[PDB]
Amino acid sequence: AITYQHPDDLPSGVDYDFIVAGGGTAGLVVASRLSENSNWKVLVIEAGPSNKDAFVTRVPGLASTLGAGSPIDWNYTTIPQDGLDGRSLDYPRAKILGGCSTHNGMVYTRGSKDDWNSWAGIIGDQGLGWDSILPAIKKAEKFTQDFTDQSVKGHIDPSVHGFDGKLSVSAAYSNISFNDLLFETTKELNAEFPFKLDMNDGKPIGLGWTQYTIDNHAERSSSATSYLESTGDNVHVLVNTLVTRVLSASGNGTDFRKVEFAVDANSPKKQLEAKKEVIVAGGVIASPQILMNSGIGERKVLQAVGIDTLIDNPSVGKNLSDQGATSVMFDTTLPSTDFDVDAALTEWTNSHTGPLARGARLNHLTFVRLPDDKLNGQDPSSGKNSPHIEFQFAQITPQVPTLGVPKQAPLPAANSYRLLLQLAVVNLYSISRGSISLSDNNPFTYPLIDLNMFKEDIDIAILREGIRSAGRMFSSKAFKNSVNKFVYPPADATSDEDLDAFLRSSTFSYVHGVGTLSMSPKGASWGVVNPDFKVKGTSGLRVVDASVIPHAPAAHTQLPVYAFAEYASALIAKSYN
Ligand SMILES: *Cc1cc2c(cc1C)N[C@]1(O)C(=O)NC(=O)N=C1N2C[C@H](O)[C@H](O)[C@H](O)COP(=O)(O)OP(=O)(O)OC[C@H]1O[C@@H](n2cnc3c(N)ncnc32)[C@H](O)[C@@H]1O
Ligand SMILES: *[C@@H]1O[C@H](CO)[C@@H](O[C@@H]2O[C@H](CO)[C@@H](O)[C@H](O)[C@H]2NC(C)=O)[C@H](O)[C@H]1NC(C)=O
Ligand SMILES: *[C@@H]1O[C@H](CO)[C@@H](O)[C@H](O)[C@H]1NC(C)=O
């Protein structure tokens, strides 16, 4: 691809077959795949800068520095969340080529087979069901040895991995005692915490070694590095440029093959017309905003901010499915995972080794299925193979963290711990659906984000049980004297009431949002896109990104986005023969 820093740098007289709005995770898959046809020309318009020389984004262990408040973040926050003591939550999202694949924690999780089968059923397309989609996921994957060629025997099952694809996946790990204490806990508490060889086999329940989108040179593998980099000159990428609206090519029709864009709110709007289609790939937050600012949305909402409704679809921006999470911290006497970061960065720079080479400071995920009697409501999961709860072990540190700790969350008593074991406990199937709406009709104004956190009681109840589950893991015989009492929440906070009060102050968003432009069958009474990814009621316009995925999986969402984007790419290309 050729990257252009400003619209005036674009070459004159070029007509593009496809224009992709959002050079993110999905957007770069689509642009890169469609460009495989040498006769097609593809323009990507991306709000952020190029990922090139975005140095910190290359370093896997610096990922934790890239969320809310970072130089590359959108700095989205939510409306006050009345289920969380009125708190406004951050909603970290990357503003940069590759989108969230450039800034995320690199976790590679496919979700359970039930998730894919659930989506397949809702959408009415069995091509998205597990048996049908798994081969495509493998084809898209390039699992690799890490830079140091560490043995991952017994850490993954090569059976479920592709080795020849686009997106690099690896599983480098530190050699720490915690690893063995976790494994021995699986023998003690095997009913709740069995060992899981490969959580990407469709059945993720258990304790698994984490897999990451990290290449063979200990650099982040993003959609820019995996897909865009190898493309030819028929891909043009315009960065630092906001798509403001999509527009009718005919002017009174719903053939939304035109895009409008501008470099800032005080600059000239420019327009281009795609010969075939505009593919909106702005992600779960931005794609609904682009569509609403284009007149595609809930008429009353649009009217109230001065936008003429061209397509009245009240599902636009609705059904935001994400995951609520809290940190939990235990007193521990285990060795810290901390290190001198400057020193480690010099090491990564000089040798591509050291802790910054790895995707996290601990090496495992746990996926826990709660029994029916610890579900205070109907089971919200996709099926029997699906976990309700994730543990994402973060670090061991004598310093109380700010990451994963909301601003006014009470901190553990200094004297209550030696070191802290921090992990996130995530309610993977948080049923309370949120929304994206407009404050005004200016595309440069951020949209209103509601996560509707804890509207449904099952969501906080599941998280409470997730905390209790963590308590059981670190109560194992293996862990005795190594990992001791809870300190966040306090050890004395044991009741439903007391954990709920803790959760209102401690819960934040896991930012695995999907669903705001939901895919539904053609003729369904709700949703925004048909199974062909086309916006209902339009021509020349598709949405391909997390917004179409009907509900969040039991997983981190990058892989599902890549796999939807690959699925869309294939069918778009096919439609033009
Ligand atoms: C931000 C974030 C995401 C995630 C994690 C951590 C952080 C802080 N960690 C993860 O859990 C991880 O470890 N593993 C994962 O599987 N998932 C993680 N994760 C979420 C994941 O990255 C995310 O769901 C997925 O990447 C979403 O992809 P997609 O739907 O394609 O959205 P983006 O990648 O955000 O791309 C949108 C793209 O669009 C640009 N943009 C937005 N609005 C405009 C306009 N109007 N015009 C032009 N461009 C626009 C964005 O800047 C972006 O590049
Ligand atoms: C959010 O998604 C749900 C589907 O999961 C939609 O629920 C459907 O709503 C229609 C229209 O009222 C009903 O006919 C269906 O029976 C519902 N299906 C299910 C599974 O509940 C819902 O309409 C979506 N909401 C919005 C605003 O888009
Ligand atoms: C997000 O805030 C950070 C910290 O102030 C800043 O560096 C960055 O430019 C902000 N993002 C945007 C889109 O302005």
Q: What is the domain partition of the chain in residue ranges?
A: 1-54+93-143+223-317+512-577, 55-92+144-222+318-511
d(CA 570, CA 559) in angstroms, rounded, equals: 16
Superfamily covering domain 55-92+144-222+318-511: Glucose Oxidase, domain 3 (3.30.560.10)
* Same fold: 1-54+93-143+223-317+512-577 with 55-92+144-222+318-511: no
Task: Determine the atom of ligand 3 nearest the C-alpha atom of 74.
Answer: 13
Report the SS3 class of residue 419: strand
For 460, half-sphere exposure in the C-beta direction (CA atoms, 13 angstrom radius) is: 20
CA of 224: how far to CAs of 27, 55, 569, in Å? 10, 14, 16
d(CA 16, CA 261) in angstroms, rounded, equals: 15
For 22, half-sphere exposure in the C-beta direction (CA atoms, 13 angstrom radius) is: 34
Task: Determine the atom of ligand 1 nearest the C-alpha atom of 443.
Answer: 46
**Side chain identity, residue 303:** Q
Quickly count helices (H) and strands (E) in the chain.
11, 23
- Strands annotated E in 290-428: 296-297, 311-312, 318-320, 324-332, 364-368, 389-397, 419-427
DSSP letter, residue 49: -
Contact 205, 194 (CB under 8 A): yes
Q: Is 512 annotated as catalytic?
A: yes
Contact 30, 251 (CB under 8 A): no
Which tokens sit at 353? 């080794």
DSSP letter, residue 502: H
Which tokens sit at 2? 């050729």
Following CA atoms 539, 545, 548, 551 in sequence, which dihedral angle do they give, to the nearest 10 degrees?
A: 180
Torsion-angle region of 183 (φ positive above 0: left; ψ -120 to 50: alpha; else: beta): alpha
Contact 465, 389 (CB under 8 A): yes
Which residues on neighbouring strands pair with residue 277, listed in sequence order?
18
d(CA 386, CA 204) in angstroms, rounded, equals: 7
Resolution (A): 1.6
Which residues on neighbouring strands pair with residue 26, listed in sequence order?
none
d(CA 80, CA 89) in angstroms, rounded, equals: 8
Task: Determine the atom of ligand 1 nearest the C-alpha atom of 243.
Answer: 47
For 459, half-sphere exposure in the C-beta direction (CA atoms, 13 angstrom radius) is: 24
- Measured in Å, residue 517 CA sits from the centre of ligand 2 at 13
d(CA 314, CA 288) in angstroms, rounded, equals: 11
H or E element at residue 460: helix 457-474
Which tokens sit at 119? 């989506």
For 265, half-sphere exposure in the C-beta direction (CA atoms, 13 angstrom radius) is: 6
d(CA 458, CA 464) in angstroms, rounded, equals: 10
Domain 1-54+93-143+223-317+512-577 falls in which CATH fold?
FAD/NAD(P)-binding domain (3.50.50)
H or E element at residue 21: strand 18-21
Pairing of β 141-143 and β 167-169 = parallel
Which residues on neighbouring strands pair with residue 297, listed in sequence order?
312
Method used to solve the structure: X-ray
Residue 135 CB neighbours (<10 A) = 10
d(CA 506, CA 512) in angstroms, rounded, equals: 18
- Measured in Å, residue 205 CA sits from the centre of ligand 1 at 26
Q: Could you please report the per-residue DSSP string of 237-281?
A: EE-S-EEEEEE-SSSSSSB--EEEEESSTTS--EEEE-SSEEEE-
Contact 188, 476 (CB under 8 A): yes
- 79 burial type by CB count under 10 A (0-12 exposed, 13-18 middle, 19+ buried): middle
433 CA to centre of own chain: 16
Q: Is the C-beta atom of 69 inside 6 A of ligand 3?
A: yes
Pairing of β 508-509 and β 258-262 = unpaired
Q: Which of 93, 202, 224, 66 is nearest to 510 (CA)?
A: 93
d(CA 498, CA 28) in angstroms, rounded, equals: 45
End-to-end CA separation in angstroms for the chain: 23
Least distant ligand from the CA of 122: 2
Q: Which of 122, 124, 176, 179 is nearest to 155 (CA)?
A: 179
Token pair 């509601």 in the structure block, residue: 450
Which tokens sit at 85? 């003591």
Q: Is the C-beta atom of 95 inside 6 A of ligand 3?
A: yes
Following CA atoms 436, 442, 445, 449 in sequence, which dihedral angle do they give, to the nearest 10 degrees?
A: -10
Residues 6+ apart with CB under 8 A from 471: 486
Q: Which residues of 457-487 are buried (b: 16+ CB within 10 A; e: fewer)?
A: ebbbbbbbbbbebbbebbebebbeebbbbbb
Following CA atoms 363, 134, 323, 465 in sequence, which dihedral angle do they give, to the nearest 10 degrees?
A: -70
d(CA 422, CA 420) in angstroms, rounded, equals: 6
Contact 205, 369 (CB under 8 A): yes
Residue with the nearest Cα to atom 23 of ligand 1?
558
The one catalytic residue in 103, 161, 236, 512 is 512
- Measured in Å, residue 458 CA sits from the centre of ligand 3 at 35
151 CA to centre of own chain: 28
d(CA 409, CA 405) in angstroms, rounded, equals: 6
Which tokens sit at 576? 């033009």
Report the SS3 class of residue 570: helix
- Measured in Å, residue 55 CA sits from the centre of ligand 3 at 17
Interior angle at CA 222, CA 218 and CA 225, nearest 5: 80
Least distant ligand from the CA of 49: 1
The number of residues making up the chain comes to 577
CA of 116: how far to CAs of 119, 135, 525, 527, 568, in Å? 5, 13, 22, 18, 15
Alpha helices by DSSP H, listed for 273-340, are 283-293, 299-304
Contact 505, 460 (CB under 8 A): no
d(CA 371, CA 205) in angstroms, rounded, equals: 13
d(CA 564, CA 531) in angstroms, rounded, equals: 11
DSSP letter, residue 72: T
Token pair 């003429």 in the structure block, residue: 308
d(CA 489, CA 330) in angstroms, rounded, equals: 9
d(CA 161, CA 144) in angstroms, rounded, equals: 10
- Strands annotated E in 398-442: 419-427, 434-437
d(CA 19, CA 430) in angstroms, rounded, equals: 34
Contact 317, 547 (CB under 8 A): no
H or E element at residue 3: strand 2-4
Q: Is the C-beta atom of 73 inside 6 A of ligand 3?
A: yes
DSSP letter, residue 531: T
d(CA 80, CA 155) in angstroms, rounded, equals: 42
d(CA 481, CA 483) in angstroms, rounded, equals: 6
Residue with the nearest Cα to atom 8 of ligand 2?
526
d(CA 511, CA 515) in angstroms, rounded, equals: 12
Q: Is 556 annotated as catalytic?
A: yes
Least distant ligand from the CA of 221: 1
